[PDB]
Structure 1
Amino acid sequence: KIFKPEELRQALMPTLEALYRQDPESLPFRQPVDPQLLGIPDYFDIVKNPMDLSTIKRKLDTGQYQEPWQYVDDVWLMFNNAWLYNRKTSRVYKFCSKLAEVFEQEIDPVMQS
């Protein structure tokens, strides 16, 4: 399968918009984690490949995703980073789990069509 980066933007962005629409749950994920602001100097040691909603959006806008699984992989990376770093009792971990539930519902059909 070959994929038109504009047809992939138009097909995938509604799945990304679905994540942005979650308030408060998307708020920690809208910009890159800043360990200095959050006071977590070990973050970049634990998380080798950061990802966040703004980075995925800019990649989608710059035609960075040759095929859609590459997009799906970045969304799951963002989730797995937050689950790795954060305690299970934490607000951000629980927010992550909510976003992943939203993403699974939204991406399911899209990757069918």
Structure 2
Amino acid sequence: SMNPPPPETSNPNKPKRQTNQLQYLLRVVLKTLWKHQFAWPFQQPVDAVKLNLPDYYKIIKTPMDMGTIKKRLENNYYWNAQECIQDFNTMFTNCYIYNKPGDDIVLMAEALEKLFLQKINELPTEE
């Protein structure tokens, strides 16, 4: 079965802001997770064809991944930090919902989520 259109990363109808929290989400949060040895399954939208997951998009209706988040941050898609934090949490939750609890990919998400939670705990105050 086919992949859906990816989540949007560009929309001139959507109002945008550049804020110090969003800057931190790129410079600290995304960068920390992206360079991790376990980042690779999360660096692009789930490719149900390549990965032979024909039911993935039957089950997962709000897909999200760090490639999309990276584009949203680099291309100033967000208004606030909570939108971006929600995207990360959607990505993790999708992984835990779709995959079996003993899968390596769940351990990988868990390790990335541990770092995410630490960095979000230190989210800078709004300027």
TM-score between both structures, scaled by the size of structure 2: 0.80
Q: Give aligned-pair identity as a percent.
A: 31
The answer as to whether partners of 1:9 and 1:61 remain within 8 angstroms in 2 is no
Q: Which of 90, 97, 108 is residue 110 of structure 2 equivalent to? A: 97
CA distance in 2: counterparts of 1:71 and 1:111, whole angstroms: 14
Unaligned runs of 5+ in 2: 1-15
CA distance in 2: counterparts of 1:40 and 1:26, whole angstroms: 19
CA distance in 1: counterparts of 2:21 and 2:67, whole angstroms: 17
Displacement, 1:7? 3.3
CA distance in 1: counterparts of 2:63 and 2:19, whole angstroms: 25
The answer as to whether partners of 1:68 and 1:111 remain within 8 angstroms in 2 is no
TM-score between both structures, scaled by the size of structure 1: 0.89
CA distance in 2: counterparts of 1:100 and 1:53, whole angstroms: 12
Unaligned runs of 5+ in 1: none
Q: Which of 75, 78, 83 is residue 62 of structure 1 equivalent to? A: 75
Q: Which of 72, 89, 96 is residue 76 of structure 1 equivalent to? A: 89
CA distance in 2: counterparts of 1:84 and 1:16, whole angstroms: 22
Count of aligned pairs: 110
CA-based RMSD of the aligned residues comes to: 1.7
Aligned pairs for 1:40-51 (under 5 A) are 40-51=53-64
CA distance in 2: counterparts of 1:101 and 1:112, whole angstroms: 21
The answer as to whether partners of 2:21 and 2:125 remain within 8 angstroms in 1 is no
Displacement, 1:49? 1.0
Deviations 1:37-92 (A, max 9, x none): 11110000111011111100111122111010111000000000000100010011
AA matched with 1:86: N
The 4+ residue runs of structure 1 with deviation greater than 4 A are none
What SS does the corresponding residue of 2:25 show, helix, strand or coil?
A: helix
Higher helix share: 1
